[PDB]
Amino acid sequence: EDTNLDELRRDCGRQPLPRKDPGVKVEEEPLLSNHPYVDKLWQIHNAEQMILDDMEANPVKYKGKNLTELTDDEDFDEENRIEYSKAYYKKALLPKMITKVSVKELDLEAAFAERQHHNKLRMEAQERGEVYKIPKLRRNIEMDEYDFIHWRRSLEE
Amino acid sequence: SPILHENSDLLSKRRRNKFIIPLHISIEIPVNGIFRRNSILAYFDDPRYRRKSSGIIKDRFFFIPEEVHILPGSSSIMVRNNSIVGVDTQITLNLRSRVGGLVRVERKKKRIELKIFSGDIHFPGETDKISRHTGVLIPPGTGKRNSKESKKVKNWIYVQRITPSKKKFFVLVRPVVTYEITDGINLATLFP
Amino acid sequence: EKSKQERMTDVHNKSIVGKGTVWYEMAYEDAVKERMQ
Amino acid sequence: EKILAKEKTEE
Amino acid sequence: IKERDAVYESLTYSSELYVSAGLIWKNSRDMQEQTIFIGNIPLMNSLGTSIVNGIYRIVINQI
Known part of the structure; x- marks a missing residue:
């Protein structure tokens, strides 16, 4: 029944399993500034941006449906969300992965307004003879705040 | 598909030991898929530094x-x-x-x-002991503002000695172009 | 044995065969710093 | 012949 | 050529080798890849005999 040797060692009272001695010191090493939610928020943010761009490109598909609730796919499964296929050999022989993002939690409400406010100003800036480079977005600010709180946690540790 | 406002920096994030770039400069990957030390992935040849003229430049370079x-x-x-x-x-x-x-x-x-x-084509004098085979490039001389009729040469000129005859030699002042290594750094933002 | 630097050399050579002297050399962070400055 | 030599002669 | 023909006309039965060994030029900066014919490699029958110059020959192992 006991499959973990550490639980057995802690139940019996014997010494721990010896490991290789690391030459690095716990104090003389850099901190950690990478939050686990960074990837999960980045992927859904890119998905929302791409869906908004595709709806703007083809307004016929976007028309006739309410922007508040959009049923993209009704066959989404949480178990089959992770799909990996190594057959992708467009440029070189290398593995590939597919992520089935769900539109059930995508917050397109504020994203639609943000995009419709940003494009209307970038077009008039282009008409004014200037090039507009957007400095940052709200999702990037949220990712930066997550990175900041994780860095503060590591600093306190 | 694509959009009018294409800013791939806002769509790419860099993490520890992980670089995610959105495919849309260009980069190539080896068939094996594994890189090595000092391996070059992206190429950023810029047309701004390109020149149509056949003469090529050879801190700063001179192109005649x-x-x-x-x-x-x-x-x-x-x-x-x-x-x-x-x-x-x-x-x-x-x-x-x-x-x-x-x-x-x-x-x-x-x-x-x-x-x-x-x-x-300029005829050098007797005292003009310019190098016959070794061409010398002259930069913009800081002409004194006192002389009014002194036309300031703002462009560098390349003086080459042409010796068609053993007894008669001429000096040709060819044009020059500016190619600066330190000046000019242009690269599209890849990671936010 | 093996440890061919040749395979690596090949991908480098194909794109940029010329053995020219690199003029500008700086990290990407330094490039961003110079661009924002 | 009809494939490799043809692609080499055409391109 | 076929096997029967080879033996009849005393030619070796063999197979051609065409490799397109092209990577890059020396200084032209343009890849010139051409399928070069290196030579001929002898083929073995299902029984193990190779016909070279019309003569059935075998290869004996060594210890």
């Missing part, structure tokens, strides 16, 4: 444009060697000179190389 025409061996040349031809000079039956200068005809085995070195 020269009109070079590669004609076949059986092509009839309407210009003489070491002759000074002006603008719109008919060098061949259907080829006209674009710049005026000294025409140099190098006849190889199976190719006729015609070079037109554009520049002002």
